């Protein structure tokens, strides 16, 4: 009985934050170091693609691993 209202609460939270996720062509950085950035996001990025940071520095997406982009 309580599983239905817990499901309703988590579905309401997903419906609230689904506008704020917007992860298709944008990504947020997890790790920065030594000229390498692993970024959460960028679901549609290609392998060997020009990608651009917030301050205007370009980058090349080589590793398209599962939960981040190297």
């Amino acid at each position: 009985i309580r599983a239905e209202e817990i499901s309703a609460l988590i579905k309401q939270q997903i419906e609230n934050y689904e506008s704020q996720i917007q992860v298709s062509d944008v990504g947020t950085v997890i790790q920065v170091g030594d000229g390498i950035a692993r970024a959460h996001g960028l679901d549609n990025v290609m392998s060997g693609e020009l990608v651009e940071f917030a301050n205007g520095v370009m980058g090349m997406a080589l590793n398209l691993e599962e939960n981040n982009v190297g």
């Binding site: 309580r2 599983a3 817990i6 499901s7 988590i10 579905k11 939270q13 997903i14 934050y17 689904e18 704020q20 996720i21 947020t28 997890i30 959460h40 939960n67």
Partner: peptide, 26 residues
């Protein structure tokens, strides 16, 4: 046992909640 069954049913109902809680800006 009852509310662990409730948590399992609620997270098997919608799989986007773990992806929401894996999001870095939160």
């Amino acid at each position: 046992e009852e509310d662990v069954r409730a948590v399992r049913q609620a997270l098997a109902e919608n799989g986007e909640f773990l992806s929401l809680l894996s999001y870095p800006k939160l």
